[PDB]
């Protein structure tokens, strides 16, 4: 289960996901197709996992 979606679907980071292989490091590219900035899909994917809990 992953049922939470935000502004950016499963889809969407699928796709980030998907590009970030293909072209390499080209975020800008990233997510100028996704319709989101450039340095949040590239942080959120070297984030990889979220600390959604305080604690």
């Known amino acids: 289960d992953r049922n939470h979606v935000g502004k950016y679907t499963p889809e ?3 796709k980030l996901k998907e ?3 293909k ?3 080209d975020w ?5 197709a996704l ?3 450039a340095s949040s899909v590239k942080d959120r994917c070297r ?3 979220d600390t ?3 604690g």
Request: with cysteine; proline share 0%; glycine share 14%.
């Open 12 to 14: 969407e980071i699928e």
């Open 19 to 21: 590009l970030r292989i």
């Open 23 to 25: 072209h390499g490091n």
């Open 28 to 32: 800008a590219t990233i997510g100028a």
């Open 35 to 37: 319709g989101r900035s």
């Open 47 to 49: 984030l990889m996992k």
């Open 52 to 54: 959604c809990n305080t």
